[PDB]
Every structure is written in structure tokens, then in C-alpha cells.
């Protein structure tokens, strides 16, 4: 064991020296000669009422008009944001739900939580009703996130320190991803749908290969649990938010950290993060009941979204970049423009 | 507006009516979270998730157990938390005390009361009268402890058992009252795994908790 530990320490030192030779400049000094964004002012356009408990998750549709929300009252709701009409109301067998997803084609939705099962619901079919299509079992801990690749594949993250890829028709796991130490909390898919990243409670992030099933890179810059993660629109970078009260930006081709987003006033954690269409603005949600807008190229606050009475838990930006949606523990949703 | 838009609005109105009915139905029940460790008789108090339902005096109760710093945030709005401890294995009271201290000072649990259940008291009495094990071997302050004068009620047992019980109850209570700011209270009890009067203690404690909540929302206290 001692020889292996010494070899591991030597390899870690070699890696640390290797990524120190690539740090010739800094993102802060490269972007001094660019105009600042300015002041960003946004106002509430719609308010969505109907939930009678806290809201844990939401996801936009690819048409930028439909969205789905999850609440502890035990129901899923599909909204029409243009007219604030309710399209569907799906009761759930278990009321402990922590995530939800919407298929790119628009035919299925998914949800899961403290029961350790991910369920698939068929939206459009005969008989005019919505019924359960598939239940996927095999995890040992609670589910935290799930995203659709197509109508027959899905990737899940769980609290048993693993991630999985499923085949919906067969209902069996295809690839299992191992290597984390603590609970995995979030994941994000690349635009090309060939890689994805995950953040866990061990204060580290990993980049995975979907087809091969191996781990390529690991990033360690935080000092507490990581709660949120999201890709840059380019596909060569991603951002994370932690209980550190800080956000950080990482690079894939340089394999190190570029920027940090913090201020002395913030002392609370970060629940969700998102980007804009151009990648110039970074949206984050905090426990002090409001949201902050960051300049991703200059590390400066640009605006505040303060309209909620309790904790902000979820966030989302449309594909066309026309609006942003927030949910909170006060049982309301808002659309800002 | 078009005819189809009007029909969609009517469908939304019907959905809203169903949601209101479901919420009104759900408002009646009360939710409890059951926490504890092994060898504590946790599953025999009331005679992923294992649910349990019971009612007393026409009031419905719904109990949950999970079989923890991350998923504990879900139970932020429960009525109470039930903590079960075995009070006969002296080698593990420190672990139970540390667990109780960790659960008492949680950030998301700053407004939830706790109902404490000290289980397996017959074994404790048998061990105390046996004389083969000494509590002072693990808690040296026991030898310098005396039963309170005006607060010493007993049902007809030996003073040694009363002193042993009161020491443990005092440890838990003075951990609870160290720093709570008066926003939530702890309720202790003594049980024996053959007791049948356990669904009424929870009922009385829940009444007291609801009374305090009503008092604070009218600014009386």
C-alpha cells in the first residue's frame, strides 16, 4: 500500500506541475479592453399559480412555450406560458420528488426522487389520458437528476455515488459510471450528446464518455458540496455552484480553472446556475430568496432578480433566449424578460 | 378569442377546481418523521420509504422512515420528529447523544419539535439491580449526582433505578436546552416495548405544538 500511495502522490504532483506550465495569462487581464455590459433590468411578465407546496424542479420544452414543474404535493403540471393555461395534471405514486425532465420530441416526461425509481410518462396517445410507460429500477440511493438523450435513452445520477445509462424499451442498465466518493447532485449534457459532466459532495467534478464508459478528467477547486453544473454554449467549458457561496468556471482543453464569482456580502449557498444564449451572462440562484446576474467575462454583478418570498430552487433559459423562468419554495413560478 | 382558446380556458378551470379539492382534502392529515438507530425497537412503537397510518380521536397521522445531511431538507415542514434511543447499552449512549446533538442544531430543522422516547427500561432496571455494570465507568459525574428533592416522582421502584433514569433524561434535556432560543421544544418519555399508551402521547404533544404555533401567529407570544 505504501508504494502505491507514493506512486499516486508522485503522479498527482506531476499533474499539478503539468497544468501549471500552461498558465501564461489570466482571463481577467485578457478582457480588460472590452466594454462592460452595464446595468441589466428585468421585470416579471407572468406568474404561475396552482401549486400548494414547495417546488423542486422545472424544465423547458424545445418549442420555448411549454414547461413542466414538480412539487411536493405529488403532482406534475404542464403549463402554456403564453396564456398561463394548464394542459395536464399528472398525479404521482410518491410525493418525494426531486427532479423532472422533458423529452426533446415532446412525447414523454420523466421524474424521480426519494423512492429510487425513474418513471416515464406517455403524453400523447389514444384514450385521451396520460399513463405510466416505464419504471426503471436498480439504484441504491435517491435520484438527483435525469436528462433525455432521445426517446429510448436516458442518463441518471443518484446518491449511491454512481451514474447510469438506460435503455427504456428493455428497461436495463447499459453503462455504469463509477469513481465519485460522495453523493452526486447534478449533471449536464453536451450539445453534441457525446459527453457529460457531474458534480458531487466530494467537492470535485468529472467528465465522462458516454460510449466508452470511462472518466477522462477531474476538477478540484471548491471546498464544500457542489449543487449545480451547466455547459457553456460552445461546449468547451462549464460552470459550477457550491455551498462555498462562490461560482467557478472551468476549461476542458486547459484542464484548470479560469474565473471565480464571489462577493463579500454573499454568505449563503448556490442552488442553480444557467447561461444565456451568447454565453455572456451567468444566472445563479441563492438561499437569500433572490437571484444574481453575473458578467461571465469580467466577474462583475450586473443585476438582481428579487421577487420571491422563500428559497429559490430551480432555474431555466429557453432555447431562443427570450425569457427566464424561476421557481421557489413559496409555491410560485415567474417568467422574466 | 377563438373557440378553441375558450375551451382550453374551461379545461384549465376544471383542473384548478380539482387541484383545490385535492389540497383541501390533504390539509387534514399530519406528518411525522421517524429517526433512530439499530437495536432501539424503532419499528415497534405504535402497536425506500415504509409508511404507517393510524388515527386517534378522529385525527389522522402519517409516519415515515427512510432505510443524511442532504435528504433531510425535504422534511422541513413536518409536525414533529420522533427520536428513539435504547437506554440499556451503556457503550453507545455517547453515539446517541452525538446524533441527537447533530439533529438538534441542523440549519433546516430550526423550527421543528422533537418527541424523545427512551426505550427498553425493563432491561435497564434489571441491569441496575444486577450490579455487574457501573454507569460511572463511562460517565464519572454519575457518582456526584443526586436526585432532585422536590422533583422526584416514582411509581414504587428502587431509588437506584430512579437515579439512573433521571441522569440520562437530564443529559438529553440539558443538551436540548443549551441553545434553542425557545423556538422549539423537546418532549421526553419512558417506554418498555410492551406499552400500548404510545399513540396518545404523540397526540398530546402535537396539540401542544399546534397551540404554540397558533400563539405565535397572533403575536401573543
Amino acid at each position, epitope marked *: 500500500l505504501d508504494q502505491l500511495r507514493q506512486e499516486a502522490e508522485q503522479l498527482k504532483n506531476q499533474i499539478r506541475d503539468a497544468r501549471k506550465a500552461c498558465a501564461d495569462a489570466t482571463l481577467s487581464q485578457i478582457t480588460n479592453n472590452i466594454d462592460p455590459v452595464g446595468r441589466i433590468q428585468m421585470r416579471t411578465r407572468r406568474t404561475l399559480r396552482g401549486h400548494l407546496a414547495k417546488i423542486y424542479a422545472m424544465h423547458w420544452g424545445t418549442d420555448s412555450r411549454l414547461l413542466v414543474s414538480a412539487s411536493q404535493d405529488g403532482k406534475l403540471i404542464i403549463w402554456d406560458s403564453y396564456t398561463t393555461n394548464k394542459v395536464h395534471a399528472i398525479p404521482l405514486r410518491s410525493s418525494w420528488v426531486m427532479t423532472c425532465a422533458y423529452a426533446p420530441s415532446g412525447n414523454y416526461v420523466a421524474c424521480g426522487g426519494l423512492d429510487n425509481i425513474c418513471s416515464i410518462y406517455n403524453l400523447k396517445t389514444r384514450e385521451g389520458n396520460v399513463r405510466v410507460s416505464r419504471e426503471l429500477a436498480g439504484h441504491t440511493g435517491y435520484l438527483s437528476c435525469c436528462r433525455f438523450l432521445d426517446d429510448n435513452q436516458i442518463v441518471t445520477s443518484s446518491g449511491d455515488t454512481t451514474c447510469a445509462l438506460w435503455d427504456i424499451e428493455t428497461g436495463q442498465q447499459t453503462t455504469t459510471f463509477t469513481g465519485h466518493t460522495g453523493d452526486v447532485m447534478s449533471l449536464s449534457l453536451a450539445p453534441d450528446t457525446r459527453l457529460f459532466v457531474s458534480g458531487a459532495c466530494d467537492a470535485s467534478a468529472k467528465l465522462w464518455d458516454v460510449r466508452e464508459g470511462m472518466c477522462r478528467q477531474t476538477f478540484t477547486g471548491h471546498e464544500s458540496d457542489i449543487n449545480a453544473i451547466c455547459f457553456f454554449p460552445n461546449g468547451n467549458a462549464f460552470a459550477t455552484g457550491s455551498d462555498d457561496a462562490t461560482c467557478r468556471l472551468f476549461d476542458l482543453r486547459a484542464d484548470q480553472e479560469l474565473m471565480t464569482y464571489s462577493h463579500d456580502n454573499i454568505i449563503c449557498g448556490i442552488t442553480s446556475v444557467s447561461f444565456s444564449k451568447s454565453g455572456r451572462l451567468l444566472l445563479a440562484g441563492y438561499d437569500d430568496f433572490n437571484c444574481n446576474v453575473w458578467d461571465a467575462l469580467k466577474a462583475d454583478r450586473a443585476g438582481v432578480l428579487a421577487g420571491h418570498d422563500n428559497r429559490v430552487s430551480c432555474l431555466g433559459v429557453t432555447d431562443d433566449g427570450m425569457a427566464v423562468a424561476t421557481g421557489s419554495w413559496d409555491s410560485f413560478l415567474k417568467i422574466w424578460n | 378569442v*377563438s373557440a378553441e382558446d375558450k*375551451a382550453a380556458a*374551461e379545461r384549465s378551470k*376544471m383542473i384548478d377546481k380539482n387541484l383545490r379539492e385535492d389540497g383541501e382534502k390533504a390539509r387534514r392529515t399530519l406528518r411525522l418523521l421517524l429517526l433512530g438507530a439499530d437495536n432501539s425497537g424503532k419499528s415497534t412503537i405504535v402497536k425506500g420509504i415504509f409508511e404507517t397510518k393510524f388515527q386517534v380521536d378522529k385525527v389522522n397521522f402519517h409516519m415515515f422512515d427512510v432505510g443524511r445531511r442532504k435528504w433531510i431538507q425535504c422534511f422541513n415542514d413536518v409536525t414533529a420528529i420522533i427520536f428513539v434511543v435504547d437506554s440499556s447499552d451503556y457503550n453507545r449512549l455517547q453515539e446517541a447523544l452525538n446524533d441527537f446533538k447533530s439533529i438538534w442544531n441542523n440549519r433546516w430543522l430550526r423550527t421543528i419539535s422533537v418527541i424523545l422516547f427512551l426505550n427498553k427500561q425493563d432491561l435497564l432496571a434489571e441491569k441496575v439491580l444486577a450490579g455487574k455494570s457501573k454507569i460511572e465507568d463511562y460517565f464519572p459525574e454519575f457518582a456526584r449526582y443526586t436526585t432532585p428533592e422536590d422533583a422526584t416522582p416514582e411509581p414504587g421502584e428502587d431509588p437506584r433505578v430512579t437515579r439512573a433514569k433521571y441522569f440520562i433524561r437530564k443529559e438529553f434535556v440539558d443538551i436540548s436546552t443549551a441553545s434553542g432560543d425557545g423556538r422549539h421544544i423537546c418532549y421526553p418519555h419512558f417506554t418498555c416495548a410492551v406499552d400500548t399508551e404510545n399513540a396518545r402521547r404523540i397526540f398530546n404533544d402535537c396539540k401542544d405544538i399546534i397551540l404554540q404555533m397558533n400563539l405565535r401567529e397572533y403575536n401573543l407570544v
Partner: single-chain antibody
Amino acid sequence: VQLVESGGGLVQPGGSRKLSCSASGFAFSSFGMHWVRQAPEKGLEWVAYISSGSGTIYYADTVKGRFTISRDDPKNTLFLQMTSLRSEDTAMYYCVRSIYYYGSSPFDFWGQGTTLTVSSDIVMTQATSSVPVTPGESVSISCRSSKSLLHSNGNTYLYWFLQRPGQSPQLLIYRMSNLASGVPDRFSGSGSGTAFTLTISRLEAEDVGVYYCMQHLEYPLTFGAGTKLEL
């Protein structure tokens, strides 16, 4: 999915009858239902409408004050009450299901009909009445309206139906552009305000009959005249 109608028969002028329809195979209580009748040799005509929850009822001016529509959700039955029957009520009646939400496809399923014999508005017409066709070719069918069917929200409300000889009408195109479920891709539909066309590519057998175009912009619902295709 099934829809079976009962009743019908011969009746003297001034009499009364009651028509019934039983549904089995789908969530009946979440659908709105229509009555449509057809004369022995004429086209299609709309009669009445009842909404889910029984909160909205509509009638045509020809039958207002004499006909009544009702439903019984627990038994999954739809009713129509006759009163003061006339010689112009000799037709065969149809029961049609319809559901309304964002992205839905109303007028999906039609049941078989029962025959009853007795002893302003948007005008939209189909100039063509008969076209000879051969297999393996392409045919275009067009009809025009009186006023614009393009709403402010961006939707154009026009529908297409096909009725084969000795059968019940079937939905092809809803809202002027979308294909219904089970319809082969050789059908297409496009048009502008007031002027619409339907295109069939690689015509084959089992695709001969009468085509109808209907508007759904406002009540009452109005059908066309009908263009038939012959070998």
C-alpha cells in the same frame, strides 16, 4: 375506440324521438361531443354541441327550440331529443368526439350512424364537383371561403375530411397544415388566407370518394359542398 348509435326509424310529422350514443374505449368525460347529420344525397351539416362538464351548449338556427342535447358521464351515453319533427329532418346522424388544448387534434373519431325518416355565417364553397383520376398521378383539390380564417394568434382554422363509399368520414388535415395520426405521408395541405388547396401525390386505390373542407373559426360550423374523385 368505439361509438355506437341507436334509435332511428319511421316517424309521422309532428312526432318525437330520442337518439342515443354509447361510447367505450376512451376517457369519455374529458371529451366534447358533436352531432352532425347528412341528407340522403346532400353534404354534411352541423347540429349541436355539448362541452366537457356540461358548461357550454350550442345549436344551429334550423333546429333551435326543438332539439336538446345532454350527456350522462357515469353511463358514458350521449342523447338527443326530437320535438315537432318536420320533413326536412330526414337524414342520417353522426356522433363526433373532440378535445381542446394546445396542440390537440379535434374531430378525430366518427361513429357509424342511424337513419331517421319522416313521412352572419361564413360561406365557403368548392367549385369542382367531379374529377376523373387514374392511379399513379397527382391531384389537387381546392376550396375558398368568404372571409379570412387567419387569427391574430397565428393559427388558420380549416379542416379536411374524406368519406369513402358506404363508410364514415375520416380526418386528414387539421388547422390547414398538420397530418393526422395514421394518415399516409402522400397527403399534404397548404394555402393562404381565403384560398386553400389539398395535394395528393402518387394516387392509389382506396383513395376515392368525396372530400369536404370545414371552418372552425366561429359558430355555427359550416361545411363545403364536396368534390368527388372517380376512376
